[PDB]
Design a protein around this ligand. Structure first.
Ligand code: DMA
Ligand SMILES: [Mg+2]
Ligand SMILES: [Mg+2]
Lengths: 217, 210
């Protein structure tokens, strides 16, 4: 009876406007909050904490905004990587190589023996994900199987719980390919305003639901 | 100019328990409600109304429950096929042959000149969808393009709005692959209890975002 958790960070610009601070300061608050959230997820017994770092669309922002966001996410790993297992995946060719180099070094220095994993997905987009898998195996296998697809999806297992703060009730580019029965929870609170109580109430909601997987009781 | 709506019907068993009626009677109420819903969607100017008939997982329900559901959904098309354009897609190899034959005949008899389309998706499952597309194009093209993928996905265009009644906030194998910018709306009302007002306020919510 092991569970994992996925978070869709949202609301950093609106939080900067709400607090009257720079976007840099809002992303610094995001780094702090994501370290908190990672600790909460571990305390609650989740085996992997997935964070959807970015969509492919995000990389059409300016280089300055891309560098600000990517540095803020990477700093989370800089701070916590020593005590957990870190991994990452996604449409890596759209991520500026500097962050891939640093995140690879952080993955190498993480505790691969840890029972808790922090997992970043970058450049999420189902179209890009599917095209990447196709192009990888095109003409090299007789047929695609469920095992191969599952072993090459960005998210390497089905996701149990998914939380999206920030007030948007939509999945954007972030729906996990191999999670047909993931439970979704949306809340209006901006990520940088989320408290441990907000997380706990989300968990009450998510854990109370009857999961039927398309079948009757 | 396209504007579409996807509905995930849910809550028929619970409604049968709420009303103290058989599952068959609850699914008959579902047929009536889905004909209503199709009319509402048409009145609201949607060009295609997508209805998720079944997941691959649903076809591991009992044969009786499968037959009850599939007959109720097909009865929707039996009633509406003459006045709209009907189409369907999905993992067709998991749908029992009886329903595929009848639905194919109804697709053939539907009004292809209509400016409104009712589109059933059956056997929804992202894994099965992707495997089917791969196996179709494997070794036959230099690379998969966004255009080819879009042209072979179960849902043939991006979905604007998605509505799931019945109180569960999950996609249950029904997520539309090529709709990264779809807006979602969930409500606790069981499908068979949804009024036109419930639909209207759902549309206010969806239309107010963008
Ligand atoms: C056809 C349709 C939209 C069914 C509703 O989903 P479900 O009851 O099969 O899924 P779950 O078991 O996750 O509630
Ligand atoms: Mg946003
Ligand atoms: Mg159901």
């Amino acid at each position: 009876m092991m569970t994992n958790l996925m978070l869709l960070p949202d609301g950093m610009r609106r939080w900067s406007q709400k607090q009257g601070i720079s976007l840099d300061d809002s992303y610094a608050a995001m780094t702090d909050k994501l370290v908190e959230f990672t600790g909460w997820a571990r305390e609650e017994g989740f085996t992997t904490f997935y964070v959807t770092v970015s969509s492919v669309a995000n990389y059409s922002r300016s280089e300055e905004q891309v560098t600000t966001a990517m540095n803020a996410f990477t700093e989370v790993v800089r701070r916590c990587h020593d005590t957990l297992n870190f991994n990452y995946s996604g449409t890596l060719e759209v991520v500026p190589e500097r962050w891939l180099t640093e995140l690879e070094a952080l993955r190498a220095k993480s505790d691969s023996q840890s029972d808790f994993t922090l997992h970043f997905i970058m450049g999420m987009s189902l179209a890009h994900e599917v095209i990447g898998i196709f192009n990888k195996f095109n003409g090299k296998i007789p047929a695609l199987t469920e095992e191969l697809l599952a072993a090459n999806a960005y998210v390497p297992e089905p996701v149990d719980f998914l939380i999206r703060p920030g007030g948007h009730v939509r999945m954007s580019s972030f729906y996990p390919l191999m999670s047909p029965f993931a439970e979704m929870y949306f809340c209006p609170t901006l990520l940088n305003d989320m408290t441990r109580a907000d997380f706990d109430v989300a968990l009450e909601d998510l854990r109370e639901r009857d999961r039927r997987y398309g079948l009757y009781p």
